[PDB]
Write a protein that binds this ligand. Structure first.
Ligand SMILES: CCCCCCCCCCCCC/C=C\[C@H](O)[C@H](N)CO
Lengths: 58, 245, 297, 58, 50, 58
């Protein structure tokens, strides 16, 4: 419990489930990540979103 | 209400009109030894005014080609006063210090001195120059008394450590445009609550001109520097015959 | 039984250490506040007096126009714990077969950690140090080859008898602490306490340890603190006969629970001897490198 | 819990977070130190402190 | 939409003219008050700095 | 907790703080002893004790 928060994800929205036997958090396991996706960020990056049914160009 | 000071301790008094301020060494005032920290069971004599007072050692002349001087403590006061007899008659010793350095000059002189307190100022040798000889300094040079000793290589403080970083210890600067005094109050510094005044020296007092003295001829060419120092919170213990060294 | 006023009103016997300071928590770097223009008189935060001996209390909020910066930089790597808990070479012992140094299967090495410049200069930054330690013994052949050999690492404190040979009777380690190891096994590693009669070690002792007249004959005593002489580390090849593998033991020391007092100027000249701040006065070097002109870089 | 308080910081204001498998406390880890500074002790060791705005020599 | 502190704490856009003065009514000349001898130190109303 | 009380101090006034991974108590560590002294037993073993101030031979 007494250990330095000094990994490269301290200050990230995702929470991990790690094992560590040291005071340095970057020595811990890779753990399990959170399963959260954002495909809209790369695949539909438009200011004015449009639906499936809507023909986009009116 | 800062450039004037009256340092009164005992039957002595130093007035100053051109002071900077008083430095208290490492943020601690001199004190007496606790019962937690003490080990010797003897009851120590605490003479409060006969040794806690200002003594005046001698004068050194700041010439153009002056390099610096050092005074080892408490070697300065082992042949001087009621302090230097108790130190002979006793085996242990514990006191702080208030050092005061005076250098007065006109408003047409210029120069600067660094006045530093270096604990455990161990002295080195030039090793014959080549670096082959494991030579050692004499007793004249290690503990030179109240007449002090002059530095040969003041850049390295005759110990291989640079003058530049000496402002990490206690220090004041005597700038002849700004001040003519330097007050440093030193506590007792040792790993031990008590130690002998005749074998161990607690610290050294360095006086080094960083800027050379300059004046135009017509003025006074003789600019002394006088060291004036008071023990503080002094304690002695372990009484036997008097020994000088 | 105190009656006069010259002893009731006294400060004699005041053991409490009156300090001007107070240590406050600084886990992160200081943050920056927003600052504007000032066009006023009387207050001058840029003009200082170094003659006082103190340092500048100025800021950048007082000297330029700044923005709010939230500093999240940690001060945790400048601790003494982090700066000194790094195992460095303090000694190196050779157990050759023939030669001049140790041709008889044993070697004594008086403990001084001032034989290699990298760890010396790092501790000689301070005047007093109080620490536990962890020594580590990396034994091998000159070539680095590992061999099947058994060794004995005896600690011989002061007063205790030093061993004169390999078959001496001090190796029986009845009260002295010893360690046996094979070299095919990992390096040994023992933890050590603070073992001095004083409250701290001190790398600079300004004075003489013995009383009496101080002449040129016994001038080598200058600077010797016996509160630092923790003794002797001995090592032999466990056997009644001569070995056939030459050996070199390297010692790697790591501090723990460090405390330190009274920083000093760091050395800029080269060390020449152990426990001795001597220098070559002919070849004095500056603590930096030079230019040709002050106006040209 | 039963172990000799025999490290070189027993009797110090700072508290540590150590691991030990022995009864000797000097065998424990270096741990985490406390982050406490006192720069006033070396940098402004004056009897009469002065402020940033105050020109020191009156 | 102001979020940083370098723009909340700002004086940019301060259109109000900050004046050191104030016009007061002076319909008549200033009257004279009765005055006596002063024989004191510290206060010197005749010494100025142009 | 289930182990034979078979060390050479079982039946002694002093209590120890030992570690053991076996059922035989004589395998345990040396532990910490109690700090109790009896110098009167060797140094003043007299039937009629006398004080510091009292000159003993009246
Ligand atoms: C089984 C072998 C164990 C060996 C343990 C060795 C004990 C050494 C304790 C550390 C001593 C600190 C360093 C000594 C002081 C200084 O380096 C010099 N003596 C003074 O310049």
């Amino acid at each position: 419990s007494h250990e330095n928060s000094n990994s490269a994800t301290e200050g990230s929205t995702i929470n991990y489930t790690t094992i560590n036997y040291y005071k340095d958090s970057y020595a811990a396991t890779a753990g399990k990540q959170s399963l959260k996706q954002d495909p809209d960020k790369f695949a539909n990056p438009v200011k004015d979103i449009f639906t499936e049914m809507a023909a986009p160009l009116k | 209400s800062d450039r004037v000071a009256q340092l009164t301790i005992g039957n002595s008094t130093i007035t100053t009109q051109e002071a900077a301020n008083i430095i208290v060494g490492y943020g601690e005032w001199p004190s007496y030894c606790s019962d937690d920290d003490a080990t010797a069971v003897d009851k120590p004599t605490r003479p409060d005014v006969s040794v806690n007072r200002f003594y005046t050692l001698d004068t050194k002349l700041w010439e153009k080609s002056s390099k610096g001087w050092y005074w080892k403590f408490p070697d300065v006061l082992t042949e001087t006063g009621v302090f230097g007899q108790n130190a002979q008659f006793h085996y242990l010793y514990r006191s702080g210090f208030c050092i005061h350095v005076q250098c007065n000059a006109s408003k047409f002189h210029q120069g600067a001195l660094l006045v530093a307190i270096l604990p455990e100022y161990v002295i080195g040798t030039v090793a014959g120059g080549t670096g082959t000889e494991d030579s050692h300094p004499p007793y004249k040079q290690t503990q030179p008394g109240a007449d002090g000793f002059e530095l040969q290589h003041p850049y390295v403080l005759d110990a291989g450590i640079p003058i530049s970083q000496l402002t990490v210890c206690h220090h004041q600067r005597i700038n002849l445009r700004t001040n003519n005094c330097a007050t440093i109050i030193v506590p007792y510094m040792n790993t031990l609550p008590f130690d002998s005044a005749l074998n161990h020296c607690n610290f050294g007092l360095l006086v080094v001109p960083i800027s050379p003295l300059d004046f135009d001829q017509g003025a006074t060419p003789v600019i002394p520097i006088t060291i004036t120092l008071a023990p503080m919170c002094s304690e002695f213990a372990g009484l036997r015959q008097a020994v000088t060294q | 039984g105190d009656r006069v006023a010259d002893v009731i009103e006294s400060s004699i016997g005041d053991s409490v250490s009156r300090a001007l300071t107070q240590a406050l928590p600084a886990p992160t770097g200081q943050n920056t506040q927003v600052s504007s223009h000032r066009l006023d008189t009387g207050e001058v935060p840029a003009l200082q007096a170094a003659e006082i001996g103190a340092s500048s209390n100025t800021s950048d909020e007082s000297m330029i126009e700044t923005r709010c910066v939230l500093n999240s930089h940690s001060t945790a790597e400048t601790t003494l714990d982090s700066f000194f808990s790094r195992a460095g070479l303090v000694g190196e012992i050779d157990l050759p077969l023939e030669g001049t140094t140790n041709p008889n299967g044993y070697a004594n090495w008086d403990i001084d950690i001032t034989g290699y410049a990298q760890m010396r200069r790092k501790v000689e930054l301070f005047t007093y140090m109080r620490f536990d330690a962890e020594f580590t013994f990396v034994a091998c052949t000159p070539t680095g080859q590992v061999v099947p050999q058994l060794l004995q690492y005896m600690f011989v404190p002061p007063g205790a008898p030093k061993p004169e040979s390999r078959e001496s009777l001090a190796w029986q380690t009845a009260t002295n602490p010893s360690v046996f190891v094979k070299l095919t096994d990992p390096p040994a590693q023992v933890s050590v306490p603070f073992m001095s009669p004083a409250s701290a070690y001190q790398w600079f002792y300004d004075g003489y340890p013995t009383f009496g007249e101080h002449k040129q004959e016994k001038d080598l005593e200058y600077g010797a603190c016996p509160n630092n002489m923790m003794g002797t580390f001995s090592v032999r090849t466990v056997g009644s006969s001569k070995s056939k593998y030459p050996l070199v033991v390297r010692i790697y020391m790591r501090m723990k629970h460090v405390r330190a007092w009274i920083p000093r100027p760091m050395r800029n000249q080269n060390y020449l001897f152990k426990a001795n701040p001597n220098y070559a006065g002919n070849s004095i070097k500056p603590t930096g490198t030079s230019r040709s002109a002050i106006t040209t870089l």
